[PDB]
C-alpha cells in the first residue's frame, strides 16, 4: 500500500519498402517488410506473447502472427495501407495487448527506398509481480 510503481517499455515499429527491379506476375511493384522490435537489440520477448499483423484483406491469409522474434512480415504488393499491429503481452490482467495502426506507405519509383521507424512507449502502472519481472527483464 505505501509503494507503487510505473514500468515503461520502449517498442520500435517500422517498415522498409522498395520498388522492385521488375514487377511480379501479379503486378506487385514493391517488396516491403514491417516489424516490431525493441530498441538496440533489446529483448521484448520477455513480456511479448505474440504480435499479430493485420494485413489488408486484399492479401490472402491476412492475419499474420509471430509468437517468436523476429516479429515481422515480409510481403510484396502494389499499394500502401493502414496495417493494424497487435502486441499481446505475457500478462494475466488488463491490458492483455495494445494496438497500433501502422501506416505502411510506399514511395514511387524514382524515390529511394522507404526506411521508416516509429518509436512507441508503453507505461504499465502497478503491474503484477510476475509481469513486472517480465517487463524488467527487457
Amino acid at each position: 500500500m505505501a509503494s507503487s510503481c510505473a514500468v515503461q517499455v520502449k517498442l520500435e515499429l517500422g517498415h522498409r519498402a522498395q520498388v522492385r527491379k521488375k514487377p511480379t506476375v501479379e503486378g506487385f511493384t514493391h517488396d516491403w517488410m514491417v516489424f516490431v522490435r525493441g530498441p538496440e537489440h533489446s529483448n521484448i520477448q520477455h513480456f511479448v506473447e505474440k504480435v499479430v499483423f493485420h494485413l489488408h484483406e486484399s492479401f490472402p491469409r491476412p492475419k499474420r502472427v509471430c509468437k517468436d522474434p523476429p516479429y515481422k512480415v515480409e510481403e510484396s504488393g502494389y499499394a500502401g495501407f493502414i496495417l493494424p499491429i497487435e502486441v499481446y503481452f505475457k500478462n494475466k490482467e488488463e491490458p492483455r495487448k495494445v494496438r497500433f495502426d501502422y501506416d505502411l506507405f510506399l514511395h514511387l519509383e524514382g524515390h529511394p527506398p522507404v526506411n521508416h521507424l516509429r518509436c512507441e512507449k508503453l507505461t504499465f502502472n502497478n503491474p503484477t509481480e510476475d509481469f513486472r519481472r517480465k517487463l524488467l527483464k527487457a
Partner: peptide, 13 residues
C-alpha cells in the same frame, strides 16, 4: 491467424 512461411528472402533497403 497464419504463421508466416520460413522461406528466406534477400535483404533490401
Amino acid at each position: 491467424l497464419t504463421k508466416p512461411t520460413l522461406k528466406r528472402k534477400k535483404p533490401f533497403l
